[PDB]
Amino acid sequence: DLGAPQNPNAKAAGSRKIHFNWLPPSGKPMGYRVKYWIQGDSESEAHLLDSKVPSVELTNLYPYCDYEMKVCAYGAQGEGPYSSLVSCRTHQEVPSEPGRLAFNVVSSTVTQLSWAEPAETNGEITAYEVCYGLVNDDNRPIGPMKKVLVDNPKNRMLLIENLRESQPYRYTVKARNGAGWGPEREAIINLATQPKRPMSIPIIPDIPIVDAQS
Ligand SMILES: [Cl-]
Numbered sequence: 654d655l656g657a658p659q660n661p662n663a664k665a666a667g668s669r670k671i672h673f674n675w676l677p678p679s680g681k682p683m684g685y686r687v688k689y690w691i692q693g694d695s696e697s698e699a700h701l702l703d704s705k706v707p708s709v710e711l712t713n714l715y716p717y718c719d720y721e722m723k724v725c726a727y728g729a730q731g732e733g734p735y736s737s738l739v740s741c742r743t744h745q746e747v748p749s750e751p752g753r754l755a756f757n758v759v760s761s762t763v764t765q766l767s768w769a770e771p772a773e774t775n776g777e778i779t780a781y782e783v784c785y786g787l788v789n790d791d792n793r794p795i796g797p798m799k800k801v802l803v804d805n806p807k808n809r810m811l812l813i814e815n816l817r818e819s820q821p822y823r824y825t826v827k828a829r830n831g832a833g834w835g836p837e838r839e840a841i842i843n844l845a846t847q848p849k850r851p852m853s854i855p856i857i858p859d860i861p862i863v864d865a866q867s
Pocket of ligand 1 (some may be wrong): 666667668669671
């Protein structure tokens with residue numbers, strides 16, 4: 654009968670892969686079976702992965718996610734006992750796009766911009782960046798985009814005033830986590846063609862309002 658594989662050891666091989674290896678038990682193991690699952694699920698619902706060598710690469714994993722796993726050998730007598738558990742967390746990767754940009758337009762020159770958190774954060778989001786710029790009718794920039802800097806970049810809304818009347822602008826929003834900046838959500842809008850609705854702004858410090866012609 655085979656003993657348990659020894660020194661089970663796992664290391665992230667990326668944001669969607671883990672490398673798990675162990676020492677062959679003495680005897681004549683024919684192969685190994687690995688059980689692995691997301692932290693918070695269960696061994697009873699484990700994924701089951703066969704290997705003919707004393708290592709495996711776990712694939713199609715979630716980014717920034719803890720996985721638990723263990724491994725047994727099988728041989729002439731069937732499966733031996735499993736190794737002790739190991740836990741390993743995949744790397745972060747950049748977030749997905751923010752949600753579709755929402756514009757609550759106040760006037761011909763003022764709009765609120767807001768967006769939902771990325772559907773996949775793939776890590777811990779530490780900031781958003783909003784850019785905006787004039788475009789012509791083919792979404793071709795007229796001059797450079799402008800980057801907005803704000804006191805709290807984790808906020809998902811911005812007020813923008815002093816936009817040029819009846820001109821289209823491109824707006825973009827992207828999100829950052831520990832892996833870096835993810836892809837941009839873009840929208841092109843002209844306030845002239847939007848429904849107008851009044852806004853109430855509490856008279857308090859640090860309102861995130863951007864002057865578009867400065
Ligand atoms: Cl990967």
